Amino acid sequence: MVLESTMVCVDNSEYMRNGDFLPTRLQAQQDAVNIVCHSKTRSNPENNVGLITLANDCEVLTTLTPDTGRILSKLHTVQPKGKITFCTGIRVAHLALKHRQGKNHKMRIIAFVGSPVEDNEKDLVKLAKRLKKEKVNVDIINFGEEEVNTEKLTAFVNTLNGKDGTGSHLVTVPPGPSLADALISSPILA
Amino acid sequence: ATVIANSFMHCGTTSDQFLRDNLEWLARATNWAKFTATASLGVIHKGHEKEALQLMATYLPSAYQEGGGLYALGLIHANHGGDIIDYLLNQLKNASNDIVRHGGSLGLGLAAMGTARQDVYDLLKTNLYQDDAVTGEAAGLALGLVMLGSKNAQAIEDMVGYAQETQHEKILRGLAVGIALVMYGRMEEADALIESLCRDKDPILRRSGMYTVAMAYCGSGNNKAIRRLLHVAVSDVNDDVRRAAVESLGFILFRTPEQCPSVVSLLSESYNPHVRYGAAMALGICCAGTGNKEAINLLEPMTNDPVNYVRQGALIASALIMIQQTEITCPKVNQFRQLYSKVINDKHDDVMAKFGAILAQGILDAGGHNVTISLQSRTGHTHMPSVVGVLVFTQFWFWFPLSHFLSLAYTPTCVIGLNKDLKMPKVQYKSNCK
Amino acid sequence: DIPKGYMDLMPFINKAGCECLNESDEHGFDNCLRKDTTFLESDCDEQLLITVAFNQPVKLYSMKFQGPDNGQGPKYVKIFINLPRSMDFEEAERSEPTQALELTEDDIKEDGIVPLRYVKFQNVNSVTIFVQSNQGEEETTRISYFTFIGTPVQATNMNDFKRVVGKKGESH
Amino acid sequence: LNAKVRLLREELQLLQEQGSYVGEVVRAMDKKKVLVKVHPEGKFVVDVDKN
Amino acid sequence: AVQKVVVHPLVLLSVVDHFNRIGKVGNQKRVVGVLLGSWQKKVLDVSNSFAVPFDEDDKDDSVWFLDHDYLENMYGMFKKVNARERIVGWYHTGPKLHKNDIAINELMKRYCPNSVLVIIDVKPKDLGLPTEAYISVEEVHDDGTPTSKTFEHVTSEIGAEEAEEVGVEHLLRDIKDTTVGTLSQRITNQVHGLKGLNSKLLDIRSYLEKVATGKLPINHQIIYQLQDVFNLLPDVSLQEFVKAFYLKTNDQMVVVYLASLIRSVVALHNLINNKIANRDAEKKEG
Amino acid sequence: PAVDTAEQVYISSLALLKMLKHGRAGVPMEVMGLMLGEFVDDYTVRVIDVFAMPQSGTGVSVEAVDPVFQAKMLDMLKQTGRPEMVVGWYHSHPGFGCWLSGVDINTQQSFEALSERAVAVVVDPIQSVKGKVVIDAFRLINANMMVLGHEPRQTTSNLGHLNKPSIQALIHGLNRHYYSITINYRKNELEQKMLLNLHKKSWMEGLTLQDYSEHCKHNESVVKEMLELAKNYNKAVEEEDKMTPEQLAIKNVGKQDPKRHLEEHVDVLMTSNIVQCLAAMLDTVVFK
Known about the structure:
- This is part of a larger assembly, with chains A, B, C, D, E and F.
- By secondary structure, chain B is mainly α.
- Chain B has helices spanning 2-9, 17-21, 23-27, 32-44, 52-59, 63-76, 83-93, 99-111, 118-129, 134-146, 153-165, 169-181, 193-199, 203-216, 223-235, 239-253, 260-263, 273-286, 295-302, 308-321, 333-345, 351-369, 384-394; strands at residues 371-373, 410-412.
- In chain B, strands 1-2 form a two-stranded antiparallel ribbon.
- In chain B, helix 6 (63-76) runs parallel beside helix 8 (99-111) and helix 18 runs parallel beside helix 20 (308-321).
- The longest helix of chain B is centred in the last third of the chain and has 19 residues, at 351-369.
- Chain C is mainly beta.
- Chain F is built from eight helices and nine strands.
- Chain F has helices at residues 13-26, 67-80, 102-114, 145-148, 167-172, 212-239, 245-251, 264-286; strands at residues 3-4, 8-12, 32-41, 44-52, 85-92, 119-123, 135-140, 153-154, 178-186.
- In chain F, a hairpin with a 2-residue loop joins strand 3 (32-41) and strand 4.
- In chain F, helix 6 packs antiparallel against helix 8.
- The chains are: A alpha/beta, B mainly alpha, C mainly beta, D alpha+beta, E alpha/beta, F alpha/beta.
- Chains in contact: A-C, A-E, B-C, B-D, B-F, C-E, C-F, E-F.
- Chains E and F meet through helix 1, helix 2, helix 4, helix 5 and helix 7 of E and helix 1, strand 4, helix 2, helix 6 and helix 8 of F.
- Chain C: GO terms for molecular function: disulfide oxidoreductase activity; protein-disulfide reductase activity.
- Chain C: Keywords: Cytoplasm, Disulfide bond, Electron transport, Nucleus, Phosphoprotein, Proteasome, Redox-active center, Transport.
- Chain C: Residues 1-168 form the PITH domain.
- Chain C: Component of the 19S regulatory cap of the 26S proteasome. Interacts with PSMD14/RPN11. Interacts with, and reduces EEF1A1.
């Protein structure tokens, strides 16, 4: 029932295209985004959700909308033909959240980190510090191939919530069943 | 206009015969007309002093009614506030966030003319910062009068900052004369507020700067200020600013009335009517008490100008010039009175031309034919009340109730036989003309 | 208290618009709007950014930014009016404020009302407060009470148009 | 120069005024209304200017 | 390509209004909006422009948020109001281009393949127009150099329609110079043209100094355009040209002399008439 | 209470241009749109922006204000930074002048229902074809107060009687059902230094030497016509008929030989020649 605006960062990098997941990485992330958007919209009928592609520099395909239809339609044609830039993506998502229609909505960002984050640890820690005071909760979903529980991402999530943590989680999914079912457990429920 | 004319022709006479005789007629005016009527009733008892405090309460015990009562009470103690200053301060403090504040600010400013009391200035500053249009309109003039000729850096700073920082153009109209009066008599001390206001983008602030030049350079016909005003009148774009520039010439040259009709010789025939009205008012203020007989000649054809406000201004200036004058002194007095009567009685004439004719009759008959308009004192000094009143009255193109400020400019034309402290011995002195 | 002819803007605060930045979870924004001991603190630093939205354009005369006397109350307050978008702490410092305030210890008191330059706040729709420091230089600042005193500026609700005279189908 | 400028401005001001119709007159009616017949339209009972 | 861009007066007042309103509340460098206009054969004619929310971070230079749904909804509203206007590009009041302008240009191209960036400066500069239309060009550069998105330039000029012209004339009826070649205005214009030539030459000299010192790269193109300019110099002091120019100057001076003689004769006649009028009035006085 | 004749509907530079453009788009029909501004105080109504409402078969009537369109337009303009209120409405009167009809009065009353100061603006894109901009601001006169009081507007100042009513507005109901409001144009620099660029003249235009061929042709033609005019001036002056010469100078006034077609041409010739020669010398000096 909490009024929050989610800006899912779906990755369309070239690494998002080695199908360690059953159908393909892209299809797994599509199912994950579908489930997350449906859960967010059902939890509260007045909440919003948008998506930003994390390949090349960034893209804002679907600015905050109350309907998941636009998000799902834009999710097709993701065309994973680039490389990821996590810090820039998070910054763009934060700007989009700042442009929220209703200021009451709680900050929340879901990032589909499916390719290695070629970003320094210091940049991630600084971004986490900025997000902390700004009051934006980022939920990192480590995807497929990576350093198991990537150190940079885990440190980022840890600094996003220190000595007390809620609404800020990191989920690491080892290869296997479609990640859509896994996301229903950790992030969506809590 | 008729109410203010009755006020003028009964000024200081303590004779309200018209107001009492025609009671249904007086009450037939509602809204701001009632404010003007109350102010006129108060001013009619100019100098009444002690009795006024409860006389106003008995006469005038509605928001407009109370505001007019305060304004008139302030008018009664013109330049001689005393305890009325404290009473009006208390009244304005316990104001109703209403035009009553406007009236109280005007009255308090009139009472403490030049006293520069810090408490009054602070109350006026609070009222102005209230930013209530009419309230600010009165507060600007109140601040100007309170710090008249005081050259207060803080006062000028606050007033100019507000002028540059507020909407409600009426508040700017008030602050214009506020700033102009805050620099009365210096004529050199600052010389920088003039430039700052003249270069300012807002036309109201340009008018402020030019009224400042008029007030500061009052009397001494400094050719620098005259050239600045004339250049602004020739060049400036806003028409009200041109009016003010042309009109300040009277305040700047009233000490040398002979040359003054020359500068306006054909400045009264410029294609823009605003400059024409400014020239007419410059003649009126310039030859304020002298029947120069050249200003009357210039006004005579201007009295038939196709525009209206030009005719209004010309008639008012002619009335000012011809105050206190018989047929022998100037042979155009009877003709001008007949013209006033025709214009007032004429039905197809514009209301603006008639507002003038009525004001002209009031000016002509001011004080039962006893008070005269003399910006100069008998000893040559510059009469601050007269100049301030004339400036505020000329600033009636924006606010009708301000016309009462011309009451200050009426100085009695009498020689009183005071031999001892309280003895007025019945010495009968003769003249050399019938 | 309050000034003559003016009313507090508590009824005119739109809960949808209001949002706080850096607010601690234990003590949220809603606490600072109640005339109780409940207060709002900032979890990550002394800097806080509190923004409030108004249903219809309101006028700002006086604001009561009360705080605890322990020293964690507000010291330097920056205010902006009619901000189109949320404010970033880095961008907030750079921008010039509508009326920068250096709240003295007297203002922080429960009876302390800090005056605002009424001229600038004439059509305020959303005012944002930037507490740049607390009196005691504490790690986290707190706001015991906070509300704005002014008048409601009549606003045309064209969402309530509706024909009041005449018959439908007319033209011209 | 001012007279020339005023003449030109008056000419411009008068030009903007609408051109008047022209129609024959049948007969006076009541010393204040005159029956006239404009060119394309029909008859009209019109008043008379003061002059 | 786009051979020229005509920015109507309303676009400018809209871009001045947007910059003022955004600057008045908060502080933001540059102001981004979408330009709406119609396409002639090759001359794009921008008529209207609407604001679009735009947050950017100068430090990162790669973070920037521009509303997609907001832009589409505004375009739909304007299409309902007037459908003859299709999106043709974007404008930003920033005096200089920005490193992220290319991404914004691509986003605009998403709505219009031929996008023109008109940089509408909101700082009054007395020398030059307030618009600079830019387009995106991807080429191979021919001369064996790395290729990049860059921004090709297209000539810009400010025109107007009847309604906008009437509004402009009413607005500037108090600060407008008289139409007609009065000698004062002609001499002032010539001075203005000399000043503009001096400013352009100073800019060219500064760029040449930068190239010589190495601060900026030697273009290898446009530079030889400056060389062509220096070749096109008139080469005055040639004997034949000197004789022809002296002939022309004398031919004009003879006409000026005739005009001066006519003026002197007319003035003398007027003086005679005025003197006779004064003498007649004096004689008839007594 | 009462409205002062000193009230001034401040129309911004952008608002006037947008209203003129919208009106000129619709002609031959009638366009309408809501005006965005502030009721800053009792004696001033400031309009900052005007956004057109879509043309509809209804025309300019209460049903032309599509509630969904207006709501979404205001909501989306708020984000950009224009949180202004609806201060009034404007509609174009093609052909006929600025006045209000019955449906216009009904719409104005409906607008007044929301706010008592909702000014109404009428703009005629066809009459405003030259330096004249025929724009009027009208508000409804409570026909009740027509008898309850007298007129509707206080005249505490002279800032309103400096204008004149129009026979058209008078015929259609001015000072009877509708009363005009003085329209003041709020113009500022930046918005006046940007508009002096429609025709700013490039520096090059002030250094172009014209063309010597048509320059010579123009000089020759003007000189020949001035020779004819000098013949005429000779005839007029040498005649010097003294049969009441003051009357002769007034019975031959037709904008003819003496000076009008006279030194006017001298000025044309001398201005052109001096400017051309100065430009030529400036080019001979500047360019090599």
